[PDB]
């Protein structure tokens, strides 16, 4: 609203939402609107094209597909843990389990799966 009052000379303002896949852009648009006006899914790439939603009379929201800026230092493991890809379409999924075990505390995994006593990720699985 403050931005709209600052740009009161225009007919309206447009607010475009950008970010990684599955960070919650369409969900943010739905939360602001109060109604499921954009498709929401836990899978990456649910939104494929831009969508205008009229929030109020002078405010537009623009949904965009998720982007991954290419980096030479990012690995497929990093992208998969950030949530870029669908894990059903990857080969050898257990090679990324040690990264998950490093990222998550051990007792959190133990209370999550009611399982304890493993020494490596293969035995855990």
């Amino acid at each position: 609203r403050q931005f709209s009052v600052l740009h009161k000379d225009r007919k309206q303002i447009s607010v475009g939402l950008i970010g990684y896949p599955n960070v919650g852009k369409s969900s943010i648009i739905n939360a602001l609107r109060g109604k499921a006006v954009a498709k929401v899914a836990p899978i990456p790439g649910e939104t494929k094209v831009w969508q205008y939603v009229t929030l109020m009379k002078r405010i537009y929201l623009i949904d965009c597909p998720g982007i991954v800026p290419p980096n030479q230092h990012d690995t497929p493991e990093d992208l998969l843990l950030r949530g870029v890809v669908r894990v059903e379409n990857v080969e050898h999924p257990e090679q990324y389990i040690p990264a998950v075990l490093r990222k998550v505390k051990q007792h959190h995994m133990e209370r999550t799966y009611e399982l304890r006593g493993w020494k490596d990720h293969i035995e855990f699985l």
Binding site: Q2, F3, L6, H108, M109, R111, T112
Partner: peptide, 24 residues
């Protein structure tokens, strides 16, 4: 130049997700 005003960040009324891994 336009001035915007964010306001104070008050996260005290936020309830976090009661995950299965965070329960004793």
């Amino acid at each position: 130049i336009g001035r915007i005003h964010m306001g104070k960040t008050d996260l005290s009324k936020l309830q976090t997700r009661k995950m299965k891994g965070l329960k004793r």
